[PDB]
Scaffold this active site. Structure first.
Site, PDB file in Angstrom:
ATOM      1  N   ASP A 237       0.733  -1.180   0.010  1.00 30.50           N
ATOM      2  CA  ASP A 237      -0.165  -0.060   0.066  1.00 30.50           C
ATOM      3  C   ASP A 237       0.747   1.252   0.060  1.00 30.50           C
ATOM      4  OD1 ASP A 237      -2.941   1.308   0.614  1.00 30.50           O
ATOM      5  OD2 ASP A 237      -1.451   2.085   1.960  1.00 30.50           O
TER       6      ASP A 237
ATOM      7  N   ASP B  73      -1.245  -0.689   6.020  1.00 31.86           N
ATOM      8  CA  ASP B  73      -1.410   0.133   7.174  1.00 31.86           C
ATOM      9  C   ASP B  73      -2.852   0.452   7.928  1.00 31.86           C
ATOM     10  OD1 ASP B  73      -2.081   1.763   4.797  1.00 31.86           O
ATOM     11  OD2 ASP B  73      -2.299   3.543   5.981  1.00 31.86           O
TER      12      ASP B  73
ATOM     13  N   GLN C   4     -11.166  13.921  -5.780  1.00 30.88           N
ATOM     14  CA  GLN C   4     -10.586  12.873  -6.479  1.00 30.88           C
ATOM     15  C   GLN C   4     -11.472  11.934  -7.643  1.00 30.88           C
ATOM     16  OE1 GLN C   4      -8.466  10.144  -3.913  1.00 30.88           O
ATOM     17  NE2 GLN C   4      -7.462  11.826  -2.770  1.00 30.88           N
ATOM     18  N   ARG C   5     -10.780  11.838  -8.889  1.00 27.76           N
ATOM     19  CA  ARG C   5     -11.733  11.324  -9.680  1.00 27.76           C
ATOM     20  C   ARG C   5     -11.109   9.759  -9.829  1.00 27.76           C
ATOM     21  NH1 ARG C   5     -13.696   8.036 -12.772  1.00 27.76           N
ATOM     22  NH2 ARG C   5     -14.763   8.890 -14.961  1.00 27.76           N
ATOM     23  N   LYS C   6     -12.021   9.087  -9.301  1.00 26.24           N
ATOM     24  CA  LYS C   6     -11.603   7.372  -8.991  1.00 26.24           C
ATOM     25  C   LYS C   6     -12.662   7.010 -10.219  1.00 26.24           C
ATOM     26  CE  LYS C   6     -10.850   7.662  -4.023  1.00 26.24           C
ATOM     27  NZ  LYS C   6     -11.135   7.174  -2.636  1.00 26.24           N
TER      28      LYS C   6
ATOM     29  N   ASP D 280      -0.057   5.240   0.717  1.00 19.91           N
ATOM     30  CA  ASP D 280      -0.302   6.069   1.967  1.00 19.91           C
ATOM     31  C   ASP D 280      -0.493   5.513   3.325  1.00 19.91           C
ATOM     32  OD1 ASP D 280      -1.944   7.605  -0.328  1.00 19.91           O
ATOM     33  OD2 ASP D 280      -1.134   9.054   1.020  1.00 19.91           O
TER      34      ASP D 280
HETATM   35 MG   LIG Z   1      -3.475   2.218   3.459  1.00 20.59          MG
END
Ligand SMILES: [Mg+2]
Ligand SMILES: [Mg+2]
Lengths: 418, 418
Positions: free
Chosen positions: B147, B351, B263-265, B149
């Site tokens: 991952d 995380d 955010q454009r997901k 972040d």
């Molecule tokens: Mg994460």
């Protein structure tokens, strides 16, 4: 205006709350003065926005949103109750409560809107009906196990004043007594001083069994049962000594209105040293933590733990099994002489990941079987719940505890009143 | 002083960062002017405490802690590199990096202390060694999945400026290229505009494959691969139209420096309307959300979602399978023509709870087998990781990504350099 005034006010209106709940659950007259206490408590929090309590050294800005909302909803609820009580003097309390439109009272507090509140309410009602139907099938009343904070009670900025309202207490007690054979409450915080038993407005010795430290301590029947298992006798009592070394530090002017605010859990001490974003100065927090480090008297079986930026922990241990809520549920059910394996439905309520073990254990014992209601759960958590259990169909997701409360009230109105 | 100045500064020093990384990974000379860019970028953020960027209508206080720490650590790292480069001109970059004491640089940033940093570092190093040993056993290099972040990158207050430092980029790229046959990065945010590809300082087309929307989009080889699966073609493109209806709103003075910041997901739009505790006024947020509701043009297959108090989402759907990171991993591995079932070790880093699926899938394919490193995980999450996997022994818990970075650097120094 100050700290102790706020604390004492809240605690007074809380024991008053317990008195009112008892009066509503035992067909006793509703004292208008006891209601007036809650009224004054509500008026006091809305005059000077939020409120800031100060001492003789520092000053703290306190978010009293939860207390205000609780007092407000309680005032509306009680006002209704008295309004139908006056119109018909000698009616039973459950019947009067059946005439109260609690839905209209609680729907205005759903952060996503009344429209969503309605659908979540209906789905939760049908779900609950499915849960109740277990008795008519197996002959014995089912088992109910729930979390407190975030699940049956809205989140509060301070654990010290995380006070349970009246309507929720009445609803939970009636529901538990009428439809369940076992009702348990698992919390992380202690039982008292201040604990769940102090924050609740429920009979305590009634149909609901209260716990602390993830089930490491329980209140039943009239005494406190503590499960050490892993912690030694010297690891214990040392935590008590440290607690004594903290309670006097709180008397100075270091405060315990920060999040958790120094909690005495069976195996550890959890102090709140910093608030998000930055209530209380960055220096006073350091002085606080250093003073805590000083009062740890080698070493001496007490392990320090910085943990996060907001919290801090002092743990005993290390021999053990890493206790969780699943262990609390298991130990409780084993102690009572009941079983989760017995054919019947099991309702489990939670809001965080720490509540997943409770589900886990349950689906290990009764995979037919387990019903789960989760409150304000993120997508990942929802999927995790859907993963631990088979269904999917046996999963119910709401946004706020008031949905559960209103649903329970409706169930009571349908089955206990007609 | 303003918003666009900050954004442009960060992006400039970031493309400069990518240039530097490329220079360090391809035996090219290290431009002292490119370093000077980072130096000026660091000096600019430390002069006027934190910094507040203002426009022609409102003013926002921005937490630039992560950017400052990244720039600082990068400055120390590069300063070291140049210090040994000057003393020995024609040495290979990996050898010079092997002479850099990165441990001393990163240890001063561990929130729990250098003493804990050391032990976590050693355990992580041994763990990593266990992971690397897979090649000598199976003949083929193992698979690494992580991952971003909170896992490989410290948390940032703004996603728009969540910029990856140089040393981490170099370390990850070297590690991935040298020890893995597959290295994947799964994020929730988009690929670009702004996305992971813009925030990273890594080769992108190198040994590491980057994804977005939990694996719904990938960058390989030189093109973007998007997996709709559930979303319709009219559900799609409508999100694009709404995105067009947002990007112009950002040009006014509504901002996108709030947490995620629109955010454009692939399947949805995730806008950050409010900051904890209360950056930006409570009214401007409402105007923001209402303006967003206005630009949803029936209805028209676009569902609004209040979600939380800080975030808000606009989703397409509903036909689908509820995509998660596990699906991203599965689809990627299936697409590449490789397999998780093949005998060998698998390292998974995360995380949060959303990273648990990645583990799940893995232990569904290779229960021998899977190694997991989790960063800053709470007790419940740690126990959940211990639950999904058998071991326990195959679990490694650290407090910060820098532990992983330093460990990887050490592994490189031992096996790639000697
Ligand atoms: Mg994460
Ligand atoms: Mg909970």
């Amino acid at each position: 205006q100050t700290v102790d005034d706020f604390k004492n006010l809240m605690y007074k209106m809380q024991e008053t709350r317990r008195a009112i709940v008892f009066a509503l659950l035992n067909e006793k007259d509703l004292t208008k003065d006891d209601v007036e206490i809650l009224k004054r408590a509500y008026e006091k929090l809305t005059d000077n926005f939020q409120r800031e309590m100060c001492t003789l050294t520092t000053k703290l800005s306190v978010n009293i949103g939860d207390e205000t909302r609780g007092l407000e909803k309680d005032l509306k609820y009680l006002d209704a109750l008295m309004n139908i009580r006056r119109e018909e003097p000698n009616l039973l309390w459950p019947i009067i409560m059946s005439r109260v439109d609690l839905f209209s009272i609680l729907a205005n507090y759903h952060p996503k809107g009344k429209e969503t509140f309605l659908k979540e309410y209906e789905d939760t009602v049908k779900f609950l009906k499915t849960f109740i139907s277990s008795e008519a099938i197996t002959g014995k009343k089912p088992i109910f196990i729930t979390d407190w904070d975030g699940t049956m009670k809205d989140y509060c900025s301070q654990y010290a004043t995380n006070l349970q309202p009246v309507y929720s207490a009445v609803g939970m007690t009636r529901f538990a007594a009428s439809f369940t054979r076992i009702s348990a409450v698992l919390t992380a915080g202690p039982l008292r001083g201040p604990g769940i038993l102090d924050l609740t407005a429920m009979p305590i010795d009634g149909p609901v069994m209260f716990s602390g430290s993830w089930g490491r301590e329980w209140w039943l029947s009239g005494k406190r049962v503590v499960h050490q298992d892993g912690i030694t006798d010297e690891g214990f009592n040392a935590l008590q000594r440290l607690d004594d070394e903290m309670k006097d530090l709180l008397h100075t002017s270091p405060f315990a209105l920060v999040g958790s605010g120094v909690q005495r859990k069976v195996d550890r001490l959890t102090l709140g040293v910093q608030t998000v974003c930055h209530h209380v100065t960055s220096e006073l927090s350091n002085r606080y933590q250093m003073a805590v480090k000083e009062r740890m008297h080698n070493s001496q079986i007490l392990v320090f733990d910085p943990s996060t930026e907001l919290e801090v922990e002092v743990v005993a241990h290390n021999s053990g099994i890493i206790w969780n809520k699943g262990n609390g549920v298991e130990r409780l059910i084993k102690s009572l002489g009941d079983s989760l394996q017995s054919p019947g439905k099991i309702l489990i309520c939670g809001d965080t990941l720490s509540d997943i073990p409770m589900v886990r254990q349950a689906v290990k014992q009764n995979p037919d079987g387990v019903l789960a209601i989760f409150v304000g759960a993120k997508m990942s958590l929802r999927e995790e719940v859907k993963q631990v259990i088979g269904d999917e169909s046996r999963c119910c997701f709401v946004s706020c505890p008031d949905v559960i409360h209103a649903a329970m009230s409706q169930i009571l109105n349908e089955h206990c009143i007609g």
